[PDB]
Backbone:
């Protein structure tokens, strides 16, 4: 348990990012940061899967 | 009016949104249905012996 072992936390960080994108839906900046939370989250999965 | 008519919304649910505004039309051109027509003659009337 890396405290909710990292990758299970990647989603939560990624979960909250939608709250931010939800908070500013037209303001794309929230998407960008949210997109990174997507992209790192996927990579760690690939790395974990690896 | 220049805006959507959905509400600004945020999801916190097992299938729940959260609306927290009013679209601009709903003030700008909103049907305040309680009120009624005020119809008048543009002409005015008098005795005309004088």
Residues:
């Amino acid at each position: 348990d890396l405290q909710n072992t990292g990758i299970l936390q990647d989603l939560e960080n990624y979960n909250k990012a939608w709250n931010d994108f939800a908070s500013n839906p037209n303001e794309n900046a929230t998407k960008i940061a949210l997109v990174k939370a997507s992209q790192t989250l996927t990579e760690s999965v690939n790395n974990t899967f690896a | 009016y220049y805006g959507d008519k959905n509400n600004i919304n945020v999801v916190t649910g097992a299938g729940t949104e959260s609306p927290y505004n009013i679209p601009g039309w709903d003030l700008f051109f909103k049907a305040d249905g309680d009120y009624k027509k005020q119809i008048s003659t543009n002409v005015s009337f008098t005795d005309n012996r004088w």
About this structure: The helical segments of chain A are 7-23, 29-49.
